[PDB]
Amino acid sequence: PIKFSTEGATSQSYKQFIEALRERLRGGLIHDIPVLPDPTTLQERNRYITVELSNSDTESIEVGIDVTNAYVVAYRAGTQSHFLRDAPSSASDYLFTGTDQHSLPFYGTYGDLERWAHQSRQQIPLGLQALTHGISFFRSGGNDNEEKARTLIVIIQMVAEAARFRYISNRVRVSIQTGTAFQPDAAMISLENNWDNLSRGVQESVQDTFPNQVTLTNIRNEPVIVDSLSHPTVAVLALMLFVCNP
Ligand SMILES: NC(=O)c1cccnc1
Structure with a gap:
């Protein structure tokens, strides 16, 4: 427990x-x-x-x-x-x-x-x-x-x-540290909406390239194309949904 x-x-x-x-x-x-x-x-x-x-x-x-x-x-x-x-x-x-x-x-x-x-x-x-x-x-x-x-x-x-997401666990950490509630930002929401998309991209990847591009949204509502393992936003994935083995 x-x-x-x-x-x-x-x-x-x-x-x-x-x-x-x-x-x-x-x-x-x-x-x-x-x-x-x-x-x-x-x-x-x-x-x-x-x-x-x-x-x-x-x-x-x-x-x-x-x-x-x-x-x-x-x-x-x-x-x-x-x-x-x-x-x-x-x-x-x-x-x-x-x-x-x-x-x-x-x-x-x-x-x-x-x-x-x-x-x-x-x-x-x-x-x-x-x-x-x-x-x-x-x-x-x-x-x-x-x-x-x-x-x-x-x-x-x-x-x-x-x-699932280091970005989200850290944001909640900050909230508790500062005693300041928060509403999920467009970045946090986009990650939630694309967890299975990101997991699939990683696991179906070939030469670090996602079979299909995943489109996230950053803090300022701008689209951020994610199609490879090297993409900075990929670092925020702490736990993936299982989709397939390599
Ligand atoms: N029921 C859940 O835990 C849930 C729902 C939607 C997205 N992620 C988790």
Whole structure:
């Protein structure tokens, strides 16, 4: 059980949490870049992990994560757990099996979460206070589905996206260090939207060239063409989705 506490959290305690998560998720290396396990050769008993997100010794939740794609597929508060509508069928066989499991009304995608939250990622603040607020809300068991979706958007980005992208983990680090919430910039959003694109480019590459060019967006809304392993933005990839072996 990997843990992160918001009580007196620091840039360092958050970084160590993300590092521990990255170490558990890594299935291997491709072109020196960590990659998640190949789902087709992964044993189901090794597929799902739990992360504990706590505000104090008395207030904590857990999130269940699919190691094949780093997706949050479920969360738990006490004796009750809740699974995303499109959770893999096997997720509930391994996660929170000693709870009453419930199906959430929305899919775990940004598309549906943003629809249910009535807010885009760009509009939802991130940082220690947003995470603290979300932990309390899930532990309280409130049935507001709009806030459930917003809370997952926060957790997903501060946990899963941070694990995937050094840019995002560092941005959240800065937020905790400075105690200043932030909204995801166009660079952060573009990375989230192109994780599988970048992973595929790296792994299908030939002579350091991506079969297909990936188009990212930088901080100032300008397109940045990415078609090779040497491209500076490629360094921000901490964990890749498995697409194919070389
Ligand atoms: N459900 C998730 O963890 C998720 C959703 C969208 C993008 N990345 C992760």
